[PDB]
Amino acid sequence: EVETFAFQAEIAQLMSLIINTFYSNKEIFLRELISNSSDALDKIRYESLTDPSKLDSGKELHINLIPNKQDRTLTIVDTGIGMTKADLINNLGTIAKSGTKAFMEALQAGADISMIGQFGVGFYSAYLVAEKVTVITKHNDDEQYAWESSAGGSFTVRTDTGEPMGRGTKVILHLKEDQTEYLEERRIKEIVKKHSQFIGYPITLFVE
Numbered sequence: 766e767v768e769t770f771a772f773q774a775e776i777a778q779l780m781s782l783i784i785n786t787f788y789s790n791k792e793i794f795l796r797e798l799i800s801n802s803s804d805a806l807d808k809i810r811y812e813s814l815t816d817p818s819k820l821d822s823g824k825e826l827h828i829n830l831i832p833n834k835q836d837r838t839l840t841i842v843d844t845g846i847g848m849t850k851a852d853l854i855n856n857l858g859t860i861a862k863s864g865t866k867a868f869m870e871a872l873q874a875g876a877d878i879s880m881i882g883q884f885g886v887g888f889y890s891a892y893l894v895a896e897k898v899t900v901i902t903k904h905n906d907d908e909q910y911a912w913e914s915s916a917g918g919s920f921t922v923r924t925d926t927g928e929p930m931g932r933g934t935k936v937i938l939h940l941k942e943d944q945t946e947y948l949e950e951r952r953i954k955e956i957v958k959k960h961s962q963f964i965g966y967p968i969t970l971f972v973e
């Protein structure tokens with residue numbers, strides 16, 4: 766079964782601002798998603814120091830970037846801590862409400878969209894380049910789920926039927942028609958070098 770939910774009003778407002786504002790510096794979406802992955806990998810790494818069995822679902826801590834021109838998707842995969850159903854429906858949304866209000870206030874005060882990560886809502890920068898975002902995730906304490914939203918004020922959550930991940934998150938960006946530059950190897954390498962050169966986990970850019 767597919768469950769449909771309404772985003773918190775502030776989040777729906779944040780997504781409309783990201784989709785409708787004229788802002789050419791869209792490339793920052795990739796550093797924001799890699800930062801989310803890096804924070805999830807730091808979390809499972811730290812948890813594993815007091816409970817080694819937390820790595821039974823996979824010892825490798827890494828990030829993969831996978832472009833697919835046929836499907837017009839850019840996927841960011843990590844073997845981080847993952848997210849539970851509670852994280853997907855409620856917990857992260859609650860945390861995001863306070864950051865969204867502060868970010869929207871900073872934008873009115875003169876800040877720019879690139880500062881989104883300082884408010885802990887950088888995941889939503891995915892909507893600068895994607896018309897739809899699908900998030901597949903598996904946390905050690907829960908089942909594999911698929912979250913999805915094309916904005917418009919709602920999102921869906923379902924148990925995932927696809928290939929089992931072990932542990933971690935996959936963020937699938939269904940790119941907008943005019944944002945296919947983010948499927949090009951040289952363009953992705955350039956962005957990772959500029960904004961994500963010191964991430965402490967191997968970043969592998971897959972080729973087509």
Ligand SMILES: CN1CCc2c3c(n(-c4ccc(C(N)=O)cc4)c2C1)CC(C)(C)CC3=O
Pocket residue numbers: 801802805843845846847848852853854857858860861885886887888900912933934
């Ligand atoms: C600090 N941020 C707060 C808000 C937030 C959100 C989402 N993440 C999020 C995205 C990816 C990962 C990851 N790669 O493990 C973790 C959290 C975050 C993190 C996704 C989500 C689909 C649950 C939506 C969301 O609000």
